[PDB]
């Protein structure tokens, strides 16, 4: 029986107490979150700077425990250059009564696209970053995982503009796909692609593509760009009141993204045209978008790997006790290996 595992030291970071193994030193506050808090650390073994997320009361309720367990499994499962990954997992706990939280160790990423958004962005930078997003998205989608909430803040970058896809947690819906906002038809993996389009557009222009007070105001702003959709799309809607409403609009024709984005190159506008597509059957997939000529100078098919196995959480549907979730999280931590 112990207070904490041997080789664990106690230390305040951002006015909260942290419990870190001796191998991780110089903890430095990065940010506070909805479900935890992050610091940066130096791994004395190799001198590399890492990020560490402290889970905040993950066992306060079944919802929290399942959430914390899910993030742990996703990060473990994803093995790709442009997806954030797990380097290590630990808890200072020595038993199950002792188990109150756990920590995740990840590659440290200096900043994100939200923070550096507004440096005008040359096409080469956009080409390079959007190419990395798409690779990351091809990978996770190939594992059967969709992001659903992709945005500049969920896109981490370093000095070299190397990109890693994040999901910081779970209002503004500027990057959300219309079919999600309006639930007017069922969505597929290309919901994330609509988000890439919105982000790319913003990098091209400097300004957010689609805002709005409410969903109908955002739909209006969207249709300005996509034009009012015709017969083939309207038929697919499962929302009668939406189908009606659309058919009642001034049927304003679409596009010439050359006009809408008067600075964009023909290949840029063309790809934009294909990601910002209302019909979720016509919208580009990640693998399809990777083949676009816009990524000609950067494309390397070997880099565009897929997940070997699908993300398979047998307990996404289960409903066990907080104690029961602790036992499973406990097990996953014990048998982890770098």
Q: Which residues are at the interface with ligand N61 (CB under 6 A)?
A: 30, 38, 51, 53, 71, 74-75, 78, 83-84, 106, 108-109, 140, 145, 147, 156, 165-168
Flag whether 53 is marked binding. Answer: yes
Flag whether 36 is marked binding. Answer: yes
Active-site residue (options: 88, 101, 112, 149): 149
If the CB atoms of residues 166 and 222 are measured against ligand N61, the closer one turns out to be 166
DSSP 8-state assignment for residue 10? E
278-283 long-range contacts (CB < 8 A, ≥24 apart) are 278/178, 278/226, 278/229, 278/233, 279/229, 279/232, 279/233, 279/236, 280/177, 280/179, 280/185, 280/187, 280/188, 280/190, 280/191, 281/236, 283/190, 283/193, 283/194
> 281 catalytic, yes or no?
no
Flag whether 37 is marked binding. Answer: yes
**Residue 175 neighbours by CB distance under 10 Å:** 22
What's the Rg (C-alpha) of the chain? 22
Flag whether 128 is marked binding. Answer: no
Contact of 199 with 175, CB cutoff 8 Å: yes
Local structure of 111: helix, strand or coil: strand
- What is the rounded distance in angstroms from the CA atom of residue 220 to the CA atom of residue 128? 31
Provide, rounded to whole angstroms, the least separation between the CB of residue 170 and ligand N61: 9
- Tokens for 328, please give them: 């499973």
If the CB atoms of residues 75 and 199 are measured against ligand N61, the closer one turns out to be 75
If the CB atoms of residues 81 and 239 are measured against ligand N61, the closer one turns out to be 81
- What is the rounded distance in angstroms from the CA atom of residue 26 to the CA atom of residue 50? 11
If the CB atoms of residues 91 and 226 are measured against ligand N61, the closer one turns out to be 91
Flag whether 30 is marked binding. Answer: yes
**Residue 232 neighbours by CB distance under 10 Å:** 10
- Tokens for 239, please give them: 């929302």
Phi, psi dihedrals of residue 16, rounded to the nearest 5°: -120, 155
Provide, rounded to whole angstroms, the least separation between the CB of residue 162 and ligand N61: 12
Flag whether 282 is marked binding. Answer: no
Local structure of 240: helix, strand or coil: helix
- Tokens for 207, please give them: 């300004």
Flag whether 76 is marked binding. Answer: no
If the CB atoms of residues 51 and 193 are measured against ligand N61, the closer one turns out to be 51
Provide, rounded to whole angstroms, the least separation between the CB of residue 87 and ligand N61: 10
Provide, rounded to whole angstroms, the least separation between the CB of residue 272 and ligand N61: 24
Flag whether 34 is marked binding. Answer: yes
- What is the rounded distance in angstroms from the CA atom of residue 133 to the CA atom of residue 193? 10
Strands 163-165, 88-90: pairing is: unpaired
Provide, rounded to whole angstroms, the least separation between the CB of residue 124 and ligand N61: 25
Provide, rounded to whole angstroms, the least separation between the CB of residue 112 and ligand N61: 8
If the CB atoms of residues 67 and 283 are measured against ligand N61, the closer one turns out to be 67
- Tokens for 251, please give them: 């049927």
- What is the rounded distance in angstroms from the CA atom of residue 80 to the CA atom of residue 164? 9
Summarize the annotated binding site for ATP as residue ranges: 30-38, 53
Active centre residues (catalytic): 149
């Amino acid at each position: 029986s112990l207070i904490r595992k041997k080789g664990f030291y106690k230390q305040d970071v951002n006015k909260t107490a942290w419990e870190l193994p001796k191998t991780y030193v110089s903890p430095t506050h990065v940010g506070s979150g909805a479900y935890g808090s992050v610091c940066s650390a130096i791994d004395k073994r190799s001198g590399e700077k890492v990020a560490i997320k402290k889970l905040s009361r993950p066992f306060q309720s079944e919802i929290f425990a399942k959430r914390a367990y899910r993030e742990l499994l996703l990060l473990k499962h994803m093995q790709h250059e442009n997806v954030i990954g797990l380097l290590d997992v630990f808890t200072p706990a020595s038993s199950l009564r002792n188990f109150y939280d756990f920590y995740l160790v990840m590659p440290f990423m200096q900043t994100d696209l939200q923070k550096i958004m507004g440096m005008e962005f040359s096409e080469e930078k956009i080409q390079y970053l959007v190419y990395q997003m798409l690779k990351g998205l091809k990978y996770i989608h190939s594992a059967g995982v969709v992001h659903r909430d992709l945005k500049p803040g969920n896109l981490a970058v370093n000095e070299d503009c190397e990109l890693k896809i994040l999901d910081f947690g779970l209002v503004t819906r500027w990057y959300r796909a219309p079919e999600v906002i309006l639930s007017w038809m069922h969505y597929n993996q290309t919901v994330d692609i609509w988000s890439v389009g919105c982000i790319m557009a913003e990098m091209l222009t400097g300004k957010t593509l689609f805002k709005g007070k409410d969903y109908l105001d955002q739909l209006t702003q969207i249709l300005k760009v996509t034009g009012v959709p015709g017969t083939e799309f309207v038929q697919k809607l499962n929302d009668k009141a939406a189908k009606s409403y659309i058919q009642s609009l001034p049927q304003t024709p679409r596009k010439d993204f050359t006009q809408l984005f008067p600075r964009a190159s023909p290949q840029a506008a063309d790809l934009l045209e294909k990601m910002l597509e209302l019909d979720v059957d016509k919208r580009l997939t990640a693998a399809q978008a990777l083949t676009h000529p816009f990524f000609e100078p950067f494309r390397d098919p070997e880099e565009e790997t897929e997940a070997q196995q699908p993300f398979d959480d047998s307990l996404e549907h289960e409903k066990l006790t907080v104690d029961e979730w602790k036992q499973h999280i406990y097990k996953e931590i014990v048998n982890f290996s770098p």
